[PDB]
Amino acid sequence: SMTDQAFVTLTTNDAYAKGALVLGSSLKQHRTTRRLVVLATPQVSDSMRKVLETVFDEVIMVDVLDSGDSAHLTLMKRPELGVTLTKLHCWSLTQYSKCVFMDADTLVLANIDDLFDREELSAAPDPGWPDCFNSGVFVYQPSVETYNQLLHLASEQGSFDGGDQGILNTFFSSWATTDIRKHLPFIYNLSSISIYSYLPAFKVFGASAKVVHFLGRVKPWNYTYDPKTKSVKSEAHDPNMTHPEFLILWWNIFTTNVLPLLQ
Amino acid sequence: SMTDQAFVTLTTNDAYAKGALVLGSSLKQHRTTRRLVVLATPQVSDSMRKVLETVFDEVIMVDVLDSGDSAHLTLMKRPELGVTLTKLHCWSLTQYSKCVFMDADTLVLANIDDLFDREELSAAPDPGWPDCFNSGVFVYQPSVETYNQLLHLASEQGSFDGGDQGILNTFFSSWATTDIRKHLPFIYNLSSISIYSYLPAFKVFGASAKVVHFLGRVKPWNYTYDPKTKSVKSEAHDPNMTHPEFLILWWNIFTTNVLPLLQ
Ligand SMILES: *[C@H]1O[C@H](CO)[C@@H](O[C@H]2O[C@H](CO)[C@@H](O[C@H]3O[C@H](CO)[C@@H](O[C@H]4O[C@H](CO)[C@@H](O[C@H]5O[C@H](CO)[C@@H](O[C@H]6O[C@H](CO)[C@@H](O)[C@H](O)[C@H]6O)[C@H](O)[C@H]5O)[C@H](O)[C@H]4O)[C@H](O)[C@H]3O)[C@H](O)[C@H]2O)[C@H](O)[C@H]1O
Ligand SMILES: *[C@H]1O[C@H](CO)[C@@H](O[C@H]2O[C@H](CO)[C@@H](O[C@H]3O[C@H](CO)[C@@H](O[C@H]4O[C@H](CO)[C@@H](O[C@H]5O[C@H](CO)[C@@H](O[C@H]6O[C@H](CO)[C@@H](O)[C@H](O)[C@H]6O)[C@H](O)[C@H]5O)[C@H](O)[C@H]4O)[C@H](O)[C@H]3O)[C@H](O)[C@H]2O)[C@H](O)[C@H]1O
Ligand SMILES: O=c1ccn([C@@H]2O[C@H](COP(=O)(O)OP(=O)(O)O)[C@@H](O)[C@H]2O)c(=O)[nH]1
Ligand SMILES: O=c1ccn([C@@H]2O[C@H](COP(=O)(O)OP(=O)(O)O)[C@@H](O)[C@H]2O)c(=O)[nH]1
Ligand SMILES: [Mn+2]
Ligand SMILES: [Mn+2]
Numbered sequence: 001s002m003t004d005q006a007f008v009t010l011t012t013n014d015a016y017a018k019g020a021l022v023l024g025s026s027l028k029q030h031r032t033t034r035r036l037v038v039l040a041t042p043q044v045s046d047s048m049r050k051v052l053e054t055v056f057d058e059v060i061m062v063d064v065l066d067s068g069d070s071a072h073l074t075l076m077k078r079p080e081l082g083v084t085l086t087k088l089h090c091w092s093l094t095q096y097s098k099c100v101f102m103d104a105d106t107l108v109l110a111n112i113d114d115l116f117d118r119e120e121l122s123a124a125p126d127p128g129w130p131d132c133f134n135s136g137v138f139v140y141q142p143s144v145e146t147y148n149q150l151l152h153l154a155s156e157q158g159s160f161d162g163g164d165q166g167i168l169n170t171f172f173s174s175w176a177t178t179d180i181r182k183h184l185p186f187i188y189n190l191s192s193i194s195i196y197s198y199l200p201a202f203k204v205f206g207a208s209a210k211v212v213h214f215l216g217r218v219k220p221w222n223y224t225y226d227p228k229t230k231s232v233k234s235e236a237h238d239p240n241m242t243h244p245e246f247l248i249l250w251w252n253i254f255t256t257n258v259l260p261l262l263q
Numbered sequence: 264s265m266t267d268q269a270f271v272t273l274t275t276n277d278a279y280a281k282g283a284l285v286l287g288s289s290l291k292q293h294r295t296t297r298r299l300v301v302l303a304t305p306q307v308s309d310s311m312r313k314v315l316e317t318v319f320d321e322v323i324m325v326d327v328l329d330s331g332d333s334a335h336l337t338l339m340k341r342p343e344l345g346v347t348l349t350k351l352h353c354w355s356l357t358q359y360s361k362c363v364f365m366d367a368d369t370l371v372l373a374n375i376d377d378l379f380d381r382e383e384l385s386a387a388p389d390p391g392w393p394d395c396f397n398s399g400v401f402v403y404q405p406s407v408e409t410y411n412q413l414l415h416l417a418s419e420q421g422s423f424d425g426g427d428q429g430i431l432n433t434f435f436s437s438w439a440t441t442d443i444r445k446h447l448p449f450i451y452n453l454s455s456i457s458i459y460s461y462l463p464a465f466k467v468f469g470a471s472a473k474v475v476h477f478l479g480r481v482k483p484w485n486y487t488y489d490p491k492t493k494s495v496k497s498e499a500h501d502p503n504m505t506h507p508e509f510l511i512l513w514w515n516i517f518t519t520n521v522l523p524l525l526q
Contacts, residue, residue, distance in 0.1 A: 130388035
């Protein structure tokens with residue numbers, strides 16, 4: 001645990017870095033005994049790298065990997081997600097025997113160190129197509145073999161969604177049909193889309209939520225937050241505002257724990 | 264071939280009966296060798312019951328069971344779905360050893376008799392909360408024991424969503440974590456919402472779809488269809504129109520196979 005296992009996140013810029021900082025802070029809040037690592041690319045400013053170094057045990061600099069797959073990315077109206085191929089570098093971290101990758105738009109609500117009981121590749125179902133796993137939280141084993149296989153697949157075939165999730169689902173294609181232990185409970189990767197879409201289920205199961213995932217184009221750091229009243233401005237049709245306490249928690253952690261580190 | 268196995272659907276009115284008729288027509292189109300059964304309630308007109316007897320091998324009259332659960336039904340803005348507890352009568356059908364229940368708003372695209380290789384309770388994940396199964400397609404074993412247990416649970420505790428899906432998930436609570444063979448592939452219950460929500464997945468996995476499920480308040484029979492050009496009128500934000508060929512298939516089956524028996 002102490003030395004050989006890690007939580008790993010990714011940021012390619014200073015905007016998603018705010019997410020990584022909140023994520024990291026939340027993992028510390030719930031007393032993880034594992035290492036905290038962030039993959040960062042050159043667009044992350046030197047000053048932001050130094051702040052990341054105050055929350056994460058290590059900031060590892062990597063090259064951007066970009067699908068350039070405009071056709072598939074436009075299908076999802078997420079033209080900016082080609083750089084998510086950069087996530088594949090997480091397999092290069094052979095200093096660790098086992099890691100949990102978490103998207104920089106996640107937030108931890110409870111200690112989730114029991115994820116290290118799982119084996120590669122363990123992930124939660126994606127609400128959009130639930131025979132695919134969501135690649136925002138997953139348990140994997142760093143490996144030079146797997147790393148290079150994934151790079152090769154990405155170069156030769158690309159990804160069916162132009163980002164990491166398509167290629168990871170294609171590589172780890174047995175997930176839907178083999179080994180139910182590699183299905184993480186949905187409470188380890190609770191997309192705000194699910195709360196909005198089937199509120200009765202959230203009402204009975206949502207109290208057990210361990211990780212919330214602010215999946216979608218609008219991210220927590222794109223809201224206007226008032227720390228005096230603890231509210232955000234919001235617009236119509238916003239699944240983040242079905243149970244807005246997760247978004248306010250994000251902002252509370254940012255305002256109280258991250259904002260002083262930005263001084 | 265199995266004279267002791269059946270597909271089973273439900274209609275409490277003449278509107279959903281149009282759905283049942285198209286479903287049963289589609290099961291015949293794809294050469295099922297099993298029996299076709301429809302549970303119908305007193306609000307189904309006598310003329311419609313007679314038409315149902317042309318498609319279905321058995322039309323079984325049952326009493327409406329209604330949750331009356333306005334609080335939970337309004338959370339999903341589906342105030343009409345309390346009558347879905349009537350589905351529980353499917354477990355009374357002890358003349359069959361095994362059955363597949365299918366919602367009246369489903370449509371079969373390929374032979375699915377291989378579902379009878381599955382054991383109770385086998386179902387596909389729900390896109391809204393994917394640690395719940397969707398109760399629109401499920402493999403079950405009729406049983407007086409199970410029937411009465413479900414009725415009793417429904418009377419004492421009700422359903423967390425006011426309809427059958429909540430209570431069925433509560434009763435068959437091991438589904439998410441036990442026996443991956445009881446996870447039907449999502450292609451056996453493909454919700455239109457999923458096509459709309461993660462189109463790249465539909466583009467690579469969707470050609471294999473076996474069953475489409477027109478889940479949501481607007482049903483196929485509510486569209487205005489022009490048989491001359493094979494088109495429907497549609498409004499903004501319609502997940503059914505992402506891949507509208509499923510809706511058009513519904514209408515082509517209705518127009519050619521079913522409408523002439525009604526009008
Ligand atoms: C829909 O059509 C209109 C939009 O075209 C819509 O109007 C909307 O306007 C708002 C947009 O500004 C919208 O906010 C919503 O934002 C999300 C849309 O971005 C929406 O969630 C939906 O869209 C997401 C995509 O962002 C779908 O996720 C799917 O695709 C993701 C990648 O694009 C997957 O992420 C995964 O893959 C990454 C890349 O490989 C990987 O790096 C990640 O780690 C991994 O998570 C995801 O898995 C996959 O499912 C959602 O499925 C889909 O629900 C939110 O609901 C919402 O916040 C408003 O909702 C809306 O008003 C109009 O209303 C609709 O008819
Ligand atoms: C959201 O806010 C606005 C909604 O008011 C929305 O504006 C919309 O207006 C249109 C409405 O005409 C909308 O069309 C929509 O149609 C679908 C629903 O009507 C919607 O899908 C969403 O809603 C359904 C609810 O019907 C969710 O399903 C969940 O709940 C179901 C039961 O209610 C579950 O069904 C299951 O359970 C039954 C009862 O127990 C059982 O009998 C069944 O057999 C079984 O299937 C289901 O499993 C569960 O998931 C969906 O999850 C959810 O996606 C479409 O997305 C939507 O298109 C227009 O799109 C929109 O303009 C506004 O845009 C949004 O921000
Ligand atoms: O410009 C970007 C886009 C994405 N990411 C990283 O890739 C992940 C996946 O992207 P995102 O969460 O936006 O996808 P979603 O979950 O919304 O589909 C993020 O959480 C970040 O870790 C990044 O660093 N920079
Ligand atoms: O007024 C109704 C409502 C529902 N149903 C039956 O219950 C199923 C579940 O309801 P629906 O499909 O509308 O729910 P959804 O799948 O849209 O959540 C239907 O397919 C029908 O078989 C019915 O017979 N009459
Ligand atoms: Mn994300
Ligand atoms: Mn249905």
